[PDB]
């Protein structure tokens, strides 16, 4: 029968979807039978370890993949064509992020879910600018830059001066920028750079082989991640009765953005079926929902967009690594909804200027946010300090942070893939 042949063709898709569903089922079943109280600490750690192993495996190869893919992609096109493609890509990213932020603000205002060292917004923007241009490539491979305020003057004149220091992270943005510039420089040279081009291409292909092995391991890790996240709950009933409107706002906004807004843009600019493209990228979407990190699901997205869909090699390897860092619509909607929810919690009115600042600062924060699990929580502080009325009791946002973060990751990677397809069609025209 053709059913078995079809199953063989789509075995990866079936394994990942069944892994997600079985992770949900196992988490609910274990929570019903004890809820980690019967498990205890040691059994809980042994239960949740395999998902962490999958996450570590995917983080192992993200750096060489991003660096080599971006060098090859930047060296595979002329500087003028690359500049035009980049200008269109950033325009698309900005428009999509603004639309997502506006939708989040509007839905949070409509539904009304609401009812310590500081950090100046200018310093946050300067920190982002400093992270764009790293001061040490090896240091930027494993840590980022952040500012600190200390009192060094006399006690009579107590003013906060900003000092700089390095905090743990990845600083993927600076490496992306350096790789793009290096690829352009390599294409500027003639026959001299061909050896380096072949070197980086070989390294990327080997990294892709490791990607294939890790994605074959992935379903067990996804299942255990989802199960462990479900098990860690404490009081599901009270938490839902307190944060149901907020969860509904975030997920409904994400669903509207992923099923109506981005497909409409793709259909107007491409005149094809966006849902066929979405069907091509099911497996990276399920992996993104499993792992809750745009960086871990970037290789699977590149492979699936290249193979299942008709997207050129240079287009995918140049656009997707950039969008995995700078294009995060779900994080923007998260941060806007959370800011409005916190503002309504404190009974603080929001006029037009506050809404505009929320939108602009949300776009900047989504540009600056990192593709790590619960990465959008950190820049929520930047937005709250920008409004400066919502003192940072973001503690009420948490305990439902995992699910909304997972929705954010799916929305971000979907936006990246749709932009890649749009740019492929625009090049093809």
């Amino acid at each position: 029968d053709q059913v078995r042949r079809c199953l063989r063709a789509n075995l990866l898709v079936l394994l990942t979807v069944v892994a997600v569903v079985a992770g949900v089922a196992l988490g609910l079943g274990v929570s019903g039978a004890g809820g980690a109280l019967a498990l205890g600490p040691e059994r809980l750690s042994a239960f949740v370890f395999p998902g962490e192993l999958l996450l570590r495996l995917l983080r192992m190869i993200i750096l060489p993949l991003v660096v080599c893919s971006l060098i090859g992609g930047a060296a595979s096109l002329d500087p003028g064509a690359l500049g035009r493609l980049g200008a269109w890509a950033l325009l698309f990213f900005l428009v999509t992020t603004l639309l997502a932020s506006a939708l989040g603000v509007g839905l949070a205002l409509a539904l009304q879910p609401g009812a310590a060292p500081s950090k100046e917004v200018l310093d946050s923007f300067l920190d982002l600018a400093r992270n764009i241009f790293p001061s040490n490539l090896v240091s930027a491979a494993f840590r980022s830059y952040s500012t600190t305020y200390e009192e060094r003057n006399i006690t009579g004149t107590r003013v906060k001066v900003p000092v700089g220091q390095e905090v743990e992270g990845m600083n993927i943005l600076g490496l992306v920028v350096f790789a793009i510039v290096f690829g352009v420089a390599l294409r500027k040279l003639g026959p001299e750079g061909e050896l380096l081009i072949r070197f980086f291409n070989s390294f990327n292909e080997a990294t892709m082989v490791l990607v294939s092995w890790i994605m074959w391991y992935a379903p067990v890790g996804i299942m255990f991640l989802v199960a462990g996240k479900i098990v860690e709950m404490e009081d599901v009933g009270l938490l839902f009765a307190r944060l149901g409107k907020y969860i509904l706002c975030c997920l409904l906004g994400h669903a509207i953005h992923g099923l109506l807004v981005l497909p409409l843009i793709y259909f107007l600019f491409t005149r094809k079926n966006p849902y066929r493209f979405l069907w091509g990228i099911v497996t990276p979407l399920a992996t993104a929902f499993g792992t809750s990190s745009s960086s871990a699901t970037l290789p699977l997205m590149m492979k699936c967009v290249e193979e299942n869909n008709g997207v050129a090699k240079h287009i995918s390897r140049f656009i997707l690594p950039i969008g995995a860092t700078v294009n995060m619509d779900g994080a923007a909607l998260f941060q806007c909804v959370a800011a409005v929810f916190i503002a309504q919690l404190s009974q603080q009115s929001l006029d037009f200027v506050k809404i505009i600042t929320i939108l602009v600062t949300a776009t900047a924060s989504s540009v600056g946010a990192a593709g790590i699990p619960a990465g959008g929580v950190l820049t929520l502080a930047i937005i709250l300090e920008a409004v400066n009325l919502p003192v940072d009791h973001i503690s009420l946002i948490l305990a439902v942070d995992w699910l909304v973060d997972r929705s954010c990751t799916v929305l971000n990677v979907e936006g990246d893939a749709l932009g890649a397809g749009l740019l492929q069609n625009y090049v093809d025209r």
Binding site: E52, A116, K229, E232, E234, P373, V377, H393, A399, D401
Partner: protein, 122 residues
Amino acid sequence: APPPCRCMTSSSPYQEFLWRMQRPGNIDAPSYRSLSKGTPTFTAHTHMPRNCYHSATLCMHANTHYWTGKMINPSCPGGLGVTVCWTYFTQTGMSDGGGVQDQAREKHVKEVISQLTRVHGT
């Protein structure tokens, strides 16, 4: 003789979440269960690198000696500019590149050598 320790846990869950997310080698978001809740209590870390404190002093809690100090880096345990406490000895077989825990380890081993040599003399 050392003054009592004033080393409480995080006042708000967000601060604990922020410092546990930016610890070195972090791979996943901390669970809400693992975050401290309710009234703050005494807490102590079992390891603290020397590059996290300018100076450390001894403090007493429940007739047990601890080291106390102020952190200088948000990647270090406890947050940024938060007075935290850590144990007198580090984990066995573990090193913190000098610092108070190491100095305590060599102090203990030299005391053992001295008393064992005195035992040999008797």
